[PDB]
Amino acid sequence: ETMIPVLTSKKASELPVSEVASILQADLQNGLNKCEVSHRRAFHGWNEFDISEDEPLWKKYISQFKNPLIMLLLASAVISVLMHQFDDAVSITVAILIVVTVAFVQEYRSEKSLEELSKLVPPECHCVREGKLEHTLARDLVPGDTVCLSVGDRVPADLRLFEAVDLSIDESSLTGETTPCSKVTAPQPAATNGDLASRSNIAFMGTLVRCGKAKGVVIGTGENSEFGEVFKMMQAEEAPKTPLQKSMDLLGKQLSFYSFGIIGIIMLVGWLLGKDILEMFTISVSLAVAAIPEGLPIVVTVTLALGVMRMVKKRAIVKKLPIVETLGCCNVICSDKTGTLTKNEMTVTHIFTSDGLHAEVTGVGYNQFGEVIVDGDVVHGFYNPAVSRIVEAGCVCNDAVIRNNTLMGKPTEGALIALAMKMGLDGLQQDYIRKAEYPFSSEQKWMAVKCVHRTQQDRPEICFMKGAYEQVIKYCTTYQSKGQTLTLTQQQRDVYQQEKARMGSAGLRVLALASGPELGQLTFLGLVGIIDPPRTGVKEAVTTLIASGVSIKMITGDSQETAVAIASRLGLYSKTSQSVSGEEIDAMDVQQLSQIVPKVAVFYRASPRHKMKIIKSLQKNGSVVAMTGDGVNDAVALKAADIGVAMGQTGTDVCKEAADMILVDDDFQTIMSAIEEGKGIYNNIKNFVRFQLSTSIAALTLISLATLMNFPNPLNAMQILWINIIMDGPPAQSLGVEPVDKDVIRKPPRNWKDSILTKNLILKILVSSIIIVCGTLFVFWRELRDNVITPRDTTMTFTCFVFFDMFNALSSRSQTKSVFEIGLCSNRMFCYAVLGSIMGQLLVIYFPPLQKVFQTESLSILDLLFLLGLTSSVCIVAEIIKKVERSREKI
């Protein structure tokens, strides 16, 4: 009854077991009955929360339709419709349909790939009902149910523990702590209950039980657990607008202002001249319709879709095009540590024998991959007796079992199992029969077993112990040295202590091993260094990112020592750096955080709110901040961050949803490939924008000048259509599809205040436009001095304009490198397009049918050569400017 008010983990931790049971009306021994479970499920529902609420396809279509450039395109389409411009409206609607169709197809494919990659099995739960243990699905849980936890079990819901022996729960998923947290059934004081990791009497949903047996009572199901509050916070923060979208909006506003300026200028010119108002107004609106280019969205969408497809081919799914743009223009990259920077898989890396030999173990994870190297020599099997004895002691005295690269047991024991597997001694456990077992406990801090060989049962009993050095060395009396048994002296003990301290100073966890006939007279074997190593290929990637001008910071909820060791190993920590805890982050506000966070680089013991605050503080300075992670605090960080990078294997569903790209193989080379692709996309967009703006400005100026005085429209409809095809067609697409240069990807990241339209680009556009219009006006001046209108004037102007457009496109192929630096062939599509256009022009000016259709005349070889030479000043001037800029650069 009482509708079963949900108890938070805080209050459940504060109140004792009896009070919680009385409040929840839960039977600890006999469990719940079916009728009560159904009654409680009728209100609280199932143990699920809605993830990725997907709207129908029409909503996504409308969302892709909603773009300021698209709105400008429809505005231009309707204003052309009111003046009976059918061709312009058809072109605009075709461009809009193509852009939205491509965007919808790409997003649908990305969503399908995300759904297929993330395969989820319905988890089960062990609970007692009516007094007999029966296995239910995790969804059927209701508050008050008594849940039994075993080794390897995944916690389905929040539990108030009342029975637990030697329980160890891996909370790296929720808190990021690599070391499993011991659980105690005693109530916790309110003073020490502030932190999540300090709640040792609460079992959190989604965590993995690594050791011990537990019995708890459900206190929260669904969105009321600790995995529901983080989800609520996730759907409470607005992702910030991408710099690509801001640049697109700024460019659209600039284009609208430019169109308004030109129509006002034409209005003023017409008023000054004395022409009629209505025809001049119609001409102004027609010129405005001719402005606002329509191919920019097509080119941008095509280039970004090609980049997305390339990223997919590189094992990386991208939800949005501005997402990959944000990754390309990233400035600061942050990282969770436990999970994306480290394998979250304890592995033995250093072995020290009783004889003094040092052994290095390579490889990461719970897999047989890896080799043990002693003095530059690979050791396999029983090659080295000293290392082999340690491996045998760690393998026989082991209860952890790894199946299909999944560890069931203590991570430290899994490290020893993996080390034994790397040496080819995986089956050493089956060769002995464990007669007497002493289990590992916090008080004793050691574990010893007694066993006899399967086929050598007549051999005397041998006992192996593992644990802390201090406890193991008490039962050790002799040591082995080069196959000889010598009594353990005080000097040897001091040497072992020195080695243990040296290994601990490097962040390695020291475990002692021994073997002998009976407890107390064991022989010391050696020490093994167990650490949680970083993922392969991460140190080089971090070094490359640091050398590229991108700062790398670490935010994690683990201990200070582990974070410091990991950062020092990866190069993010030194002897002069500083570390800031979560309490220090919560201490100051705004200004002091802004002074502190950029200087520091290591954050330890950080709550999800602390990570969100750090992300917001980094965003306040204006730098683009990136973060990668696999947890829930990481998920809320990616939600607060502009760019979200997740892991497709070790990550969670919440982390994957909160992110914006998912990594399949858990690599960073893919991340810098995305950065390079984004830089190339930005360069191509800049070049295409410059070329199209210059061409549009020149064409509009020429049309306005022609209409202004006397001769009305000295060009036929077919010539105008072919001109419109050339500038905004295959040449434009080929310019927008320009590949990635090897020099544009070795540059410092673009600043936040940098925009596409710069003063240099504007000056180059103006210079090219004035040169083109001067050449065309000189040609038309010679033809008007001829004082005859016999299609020769029209065809000469048509060819001059076509050649000027081609040379402008060739000049705008690159903005930094010269013409003879990227290759004449380069894009095969560009060569095909220019060859097709030039043969079409030759047929138009040569074939009598096409000549009559286009109203052209015959041109001799000398005239064609002179035209080719004259319409080359744009390319020559642009190359001279580029060469001057290049000189001065280095100079």
Ligand code: BEF
């Ligand atoms: F998984 Be991270 F260390 F928060």
Ligand SMILES: [Mg+2]
């Ligand atoms: Mg993590």
